């Protein structure tokens, strides 16, 4: 695939003001430089690759002289480098050098620093090479039980993306994340686990919601938004479920969060065509337009009243 | 543009037999909106996908 057809997570349009560093200069700075010179050389290499330069000669230099460094900035820059660097031959085979990088990912998933583990798990969400993920699966699973919520929330996202792209690597993922969701206390970890179940196994997400449905009003706004998204998707696929969730969505119209009120009103209109339900949703939109000071909100919520009128 | 000529084989809608609460299943607007934003929505009308 050409760099233009490839998935692009990062764009950097830095004017290359100074003479573009020669590949030999970059190689010398990466091999012999101090941590600062290596950091600046690695930044330049990332910017050059993002701007369409192919630097295949630097791959082994980075593996040998930069990858074993324990500097936090270099560790993060290396994750951006591994996001953009070609990992396969033109014929789609994994580069032999990537086996050495896979052991570094395994070490970083076991790193004593929780932010290195979490950042590595976030990077693994962007990996499309199943052969690199397979040897990491035991370390990724162990990150679900990590003491820090920062590691656990990113481990759920990594498992979700691995299951979505490569189901055969983790066929038990929906069950593992359901058991995680039931036992979790952190609101961000709960949201990420629930979000995975919405996309991977809606029935397990509904089973969890059915245990907590009377408590949804007491949940944080982030978890309420993802619950409203589940209710929308489930009732859209299966109109018979609408009768079950109308009461929950109506309670969310009284949420303290204006974002939850907006999403609950939008969902209520999709659950019920009854005049009383439409009136409650329309009043919630009118109240949002009057109470919200931001003209962006006023205009967009007015467009929802215009869409309602088209029926 | 909405008045499609009713064909002889088109379904006859018996309003007396339809339950009053059948909301027309709108397409999932969130998924359509996401596909449109990514540029993966083939424009329905102009690019006959069999062109």
């Amino acid at each position: 695939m050409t760099a233009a057809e490839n998935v692009c997570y990062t764009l950097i349009n830095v004017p290359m003001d100074s003479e573009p560093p020669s590949e030999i200069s970059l190689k010398n700075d990466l091999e012999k430089g101090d941590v600062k010179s290596k950091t600046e050389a690695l930044k330049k290499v990332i910017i050059m690759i993002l701007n369409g330069e192919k630097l295949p000669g630097l791959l082994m230099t980075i593996i040998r002289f930069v990858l074993p460094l324990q500097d936090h900035t270099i560790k993060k820059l290396l994750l951006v480098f591994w996001e953009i660097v070609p990992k396969t031959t033109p014929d789609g085979r994994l580069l032999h050098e990537m086996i050495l990088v896979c052991d570094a990912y395994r070490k970083d998933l076991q790193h004593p620093n929780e932010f290195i583990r979490g950042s590595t798990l976030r990077f693994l969400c962007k990996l499309k090479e199943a052969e690199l993920l397979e040897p990491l699966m035991p370390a990724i699973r162990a990150c679900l039980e990590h003491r820090h919520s920062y590691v656990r929330r990113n481990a759920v996202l990594a498992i979700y993306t691995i299951y979505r792209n490569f189901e055969h690597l983790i066929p038990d993922a929906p069950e593992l994340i359901h058991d995680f969701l039931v036992n979790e206390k952190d609101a961000s970890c709960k949201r990420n686990a629930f979000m995975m179940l919405i996309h991977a196994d809606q029935d397990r997400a509904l089973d969890y919601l059915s245990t907590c449905i009377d408590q949804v009003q007491t949940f944080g706004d982030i978890l309420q938004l993802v619950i409203v998204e589940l209710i929308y998707k489930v009732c859209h696929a299966n109109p018979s479920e609408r009768a079950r969730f109308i009461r929950c969505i109506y309670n969310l119209l009284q949420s303290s969060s204006p974002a939850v009120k907006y999403e609950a009103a939008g969902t209520l209109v999709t659950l019920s065509s009854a005049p009383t339900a439409i009136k409650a949703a329309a009043q919630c939109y009118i109240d949002l337009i009057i109470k919200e000071s931001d003209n962006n909100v006023k205009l967009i919520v007015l467009d929802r009243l215009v869409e309602l009128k088209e029926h | 543009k909405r008045n499609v000529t009713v064909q002889p084989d088109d379904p006859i809608s018996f309003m007396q037999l339809t339950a009053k609460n059948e909301m027309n299943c709108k397409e999932d607007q969130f998924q359509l909106s996401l596909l449109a934003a990514m540029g993966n929505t083939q424009r329905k009308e102009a690019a006959d996908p069999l062109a």
Binding site: S273, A274, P275, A277 | -
Partner: peptide, 24 residues
Amino acid sequence: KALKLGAKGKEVDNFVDKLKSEGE
């Protein structure tokens, strides 16, 4: 034995009863 005014959730029940009266 004081007269109790206002039950929590009555507004949601009134909304649901209106929707039922509209055929939902």
